[PDB]
Amino acid sequence: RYRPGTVALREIRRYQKSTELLIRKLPFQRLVREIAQDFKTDLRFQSSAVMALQEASEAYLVGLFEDTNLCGIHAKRVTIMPKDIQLARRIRGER
Amino acid sequence: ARTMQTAR
């Protein structure tokens, strides 16, 4: 049994050192087709244009969490919370 | 008296 919070730092370094995709493929490719249902019905997705959406959504969430974790740190704690995420989006302009 | 009014 490790100290709580040290498997985390052993897990931070592991993911930051590698480049594979962190969301599973099929639970994502289904989400894209669910959301593409609204704007057009029965679309096909040229199957590299879902990889073009993981790689642009994963790289958006990660750049958001780097901007969330700076806000949580700034509120003098080490735990991100949804009152941080909503701040980081409000400062960038997004919300 | 009973006439409605603004600002008096």
Binding site: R24, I35, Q37, L53, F65, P82 | -
Partner: protein, 86 residues
């Protein structure tokens, strides 16, 4: 042939997956209320990119959302994406 309207695949962006995504973002402790907020954030990001991805295809009169149309949707919002061309 078959007719399905999808329901609740946003629960595929899984609670461990938002954890791994957070790790690459360098965080140690994730409050349990994050996992229904990121899903809120991601579902808003995916809409605006697909709505521009579709609008490009639908102009070109197609039924396949090709990889260049996704890229032009990203290039328009000032997210440029570099491994898929042009």
């Amino acid at each position: 042939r078959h007719r399905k309207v999808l329901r609740d695949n946003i629960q595929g962006i899984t609670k461990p997956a938002i954890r791994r995504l957070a790790r690459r973002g360098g965080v140690k402790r994730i409050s349990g209320l994050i996992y229904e907020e990121t899903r809120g954030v991601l579902k808003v990001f995916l809409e605006n990119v697909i709505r521009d991805a579709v609008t490009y295809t639908e102009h070109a009169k197609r039924k396949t959302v090709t990889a260049m149309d996704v890229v032009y949707a990203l290039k328009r919002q000032g997210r440029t994406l570099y491994g898929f061309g042009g």
